[PDB]
């Protein structure tokens, strides 16, 4: 098949809830991936793919580092 809308698997609003919930949860699971997807019109696979790409991008950006 193919996509019903011209989107890069996310919207400019969904990406904000993903990078916000990434602050409270750095490693979501089947239950927590669904918890964020449920009110953002996503599925757990979109969340898993996004967090996988975000960890790979975080390491170039150094968005969080432990200072202790």
UniProtKB/Swiss-Prot annotation:
<feature type="modified residue" description="Phosphothreonine; by PKB/AKT2">
    <location>
        <position position="8"/>
    </location>
</feature>
<protein>
    <recommendedName>
        <fullName>Pituitary homeobox 2</fullName>
    </recommendedName>
</protein>
<comment type="similarity">
    <text>Belongs to the paired homeobox family. Bicoid subfamily.</text>
</comment>
<feature type="DNA-binding region" description="Homeobox">
    <location>
        <begin position="3"/>
        <end position="62"/>
    </location>
</feature>
<comment type="function">
    <text>May play a role in myoblast differentiation. When unphosphorylated, associates with an ELAVL1-containing complex, which stabilizes cyclin mRNA and ensuring cell proliferation. Phosphorylation by AKT2 impairs this association, leading to CCND1 mRNA destabilization and progression towards differentiation.</text>
</comment>
<feature type="compositionally biased region" description="Basic residues">
    <location>
        <begin position="3"/>
        <end position="8"/>
    </location>
</feature>
<comment type="subunit">
    <text>Interacts with EFEMP2. Interacts (when unphosphorylated on Thr-8) with ELAVL1/HUR.</text>
</comment>
